[PDB]
Amino acid sequence: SQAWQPGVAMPNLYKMQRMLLEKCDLQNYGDSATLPKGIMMNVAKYTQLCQYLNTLTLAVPYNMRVIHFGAGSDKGVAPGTAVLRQWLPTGTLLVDSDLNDFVSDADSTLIGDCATVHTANKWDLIISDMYDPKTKNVTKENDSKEGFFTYICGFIQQKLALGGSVAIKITEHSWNADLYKLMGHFAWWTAFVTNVNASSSEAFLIGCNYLGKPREQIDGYVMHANYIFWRNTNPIQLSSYSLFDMSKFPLKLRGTAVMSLKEGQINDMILSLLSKGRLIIRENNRVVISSDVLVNNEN
Amino acid sequence: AFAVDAAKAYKDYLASGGQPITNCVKMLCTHTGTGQAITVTPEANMDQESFGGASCCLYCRCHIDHPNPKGFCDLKGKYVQIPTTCANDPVGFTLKNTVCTVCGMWKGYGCSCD
Numbered sequence: 001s002q003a004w005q006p007g008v009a010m011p012n013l014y015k016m017q018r019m020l021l022e023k024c025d026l027q028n029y030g031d032s033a034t035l036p037k038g039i040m041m042n043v044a045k046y047t048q049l050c051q052y053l054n055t056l057t058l059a060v061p062y063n064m065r066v067i068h069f070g071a072g073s074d075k076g077v078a079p080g081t082a083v084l085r086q087w088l089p090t091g092t093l094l095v096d097s098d099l100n101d102f103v104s105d106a107d108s109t110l111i112g113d114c115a116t117v118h119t120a121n122k123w124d125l126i127i128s129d130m131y132d133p134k135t136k137n138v139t140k141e142n143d144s145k146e147g148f149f150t151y152i153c154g155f156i157q158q159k160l161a162l163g164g165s166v167a168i169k170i171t172e173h174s175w176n177a178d179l180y181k182l183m184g185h186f187a188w189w190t191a192f193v194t195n196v197n198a199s200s201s202e203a204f205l206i207g208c209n210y211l212g213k214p215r216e217q218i219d220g221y222v223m224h225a226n227y228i229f230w231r232n233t234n235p236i237q238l239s240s241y242s243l244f245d246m247s248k249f250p251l252k253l254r255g256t257a258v259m260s261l262k263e264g265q266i267n268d269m270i271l272s273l274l275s276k277g278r279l280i281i282r283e284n285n286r287v288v289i290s291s292d293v294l295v296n297n298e299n
Numbered sequence: 300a301f302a303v304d305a306a307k308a309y310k311d312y313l314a315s316g317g318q319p320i321t322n323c324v325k326m327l328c329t330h331t332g333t334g335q336a337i338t339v340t341p342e343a344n345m346d347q348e349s350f351g352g353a354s355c356c357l358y359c360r361c362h363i364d365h366p367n368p369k370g371f372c373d374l375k376g377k378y379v380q381i382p383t384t385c386a387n388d389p390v391g392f393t394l395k396n397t398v399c400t401v402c403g404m405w406k407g408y409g410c411s412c413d
């Protein structure tokens with residue numbers, strides 16, 4: 001039934017629980033979906049992600065700005081960026097980044113640890129597929145992880161436009177409690193599991209329409225326990241069905257209004273529009289990025 | 300006077316039976332598009348596959364300068380349509396063939412301007 005959707009979103013009732021963190025034991029763990037001929041896993045995965053984002057209230061302004069972290073692959077190319085650029089309106093500014101070198105269709109690519117990346121401007125949508133290989137070395141308790149997740153929480157608070165949205169990849173062991181806490185600063189949030197990768201504890205933590213203040217106080221340790229509890233008790237059947245219907249894939253250019261506004265001016269009417277997908281608050285200046293480079297002379 | 304010739308090298312490699320560059324990024328699409336060669340969004344028709352452009356560009360993929368004084372790439376940031384019969388080697392295809400500047404199809408694979 002779920003199988004004709006692009007994936008499954010964490011049901012609200014699981015979000016309201018107070019579980020303890022257990023080990024994730026998926027009954028289809030590792031199983032592989034049958035992908036359409038010649039289609040890479042990450043093309044299918046990002047396609048289902050974008051098909052799900054199509055059902056939310058994303059702000060889609062003119063001159064939209066999108067940044068994509070973790071966009072490289074062991075293949076040296078960027079399949080998720082190619083799907084993002086297909087999905088996004090033509091002309092959307094798309095910047096991607098990754099630790100390792102890769103070739104990309106993004107308007108600009110920065111190679112380096114994500115903590116080196118800075119931007120003058122704010123963004124309307126942040127995508128992250130970052131995942132640390134060492135997270136595989138499971139030597140203990142599953143604790144909240146720092147690393148790139150600390151960067152991402154700061155980056156959201158500093159450089160995500162009000163009204164903007166995020167999708168940040170997590171897994172059972174690749175997660176962070178403040179990122180969940182930060183989901184309570186959006187008008188709505190979920191954890192979305194693609195149907196092509198239903199056999200993995202991967203999900204995308206999706207924050208929809210950023211408010212810049214807490215709508216809700218979320219205990220992130222508890223919320224990840226809740227997410228694992230859901231995954232543990234709700235086997236999802238692998239499915240690539242939704243990949244065969246691309247007729248309504250493109251994100252509609254809504255022309256969402258962009259206004260600049262000092263903190264003093266965000267009243268409840270503004271908050272109401274932010275939360276409905278109807279407003280972005282940021283400057284509309286030129287997009288400028290940089291990557292910090294550590295200089296060393298080994299001679 | 301010396302400048303490495305990568306196009307020639309890939310063509311010779313292919314003719315020797317070398318395996319075509321892989322991991323060209325194929326897109327999901329309806330396959331009801333215009334069929335033009337190089338588009339801002341995937342436009343394959345029923346006879347074509349659509350690919351992310353950078354991944355099908357010899358110079359992008361080989362980390363070498365583009366043949367173009369400004370260094371501009373015709374494919375990066377766009378999608379290239381490749382006949383389904385040739386989709387085992389999108390890089391070879393884009394290198395060997397040419398786009399009609401009038402109708403935007405591949406000469407001999409869509410271009411009917413004769």
Ligand SMILES: *O[C@H]1[C@@H](O)[C@H](n2cnc3c(N)ncnc32)O[C@@H]1COP(=O)(O)OP(=O)(O)OP(=O)(O)OC[C@H]1O[C@@H](n2c[n+](C)c3c(=O)[nH]c(N)nc32)[C@H](O)[C@@H]1O
Nearest residue numbers: 024025026029131133135136138171172173174200201202
């Ligand atoms: O698509 C994957 C990719 O983007 C990224 N990923 C994974 N590994 C790498 C590396 N080495 N480099 C770069 N990127 C990488 O994660 C995405 C998902 O990967 P996946 O392996 O499906 O994640 P997993 O579900 O295993 O969760 P994880 O946090 O990594 O767990 C690590 C460790 O824990 C055990 N384990 C997890 N789960 C959910 C299990 C289960 O359900 N049943 C059993 N018996 N064991 C489980 C495993 O030993 C995992 O290795």
Ligand SMILES: C[S@@+](CC[C@H](N)C(=O)[O-])C[C@H]1O[C@@H](n2cnc3c(N)ncnc32)[C@H](O)[C@@H]1O
Nearest residue numbers: 042070071072073080099113114129130131148
């Ligand atoms: C599974 S891959 C990304 C696949 C890619 N999204 C795609 O579309 O195919 C995980 C990526 O996250 C990147 N990454 C992990 N940790 C990072 C960090 N601290 N800073 C920057 N990039 C990181 C890795 O270089 C790695 O390429």
Ligand SMILES: [Zn+2]
Nearest residue numbers: 356358359372
């Ligand atoms: Zn190129």
Ligand SMILES: [Zn+2]
Nearest residue numbers: 399402410412
């Ligand atoms: Zn022609």
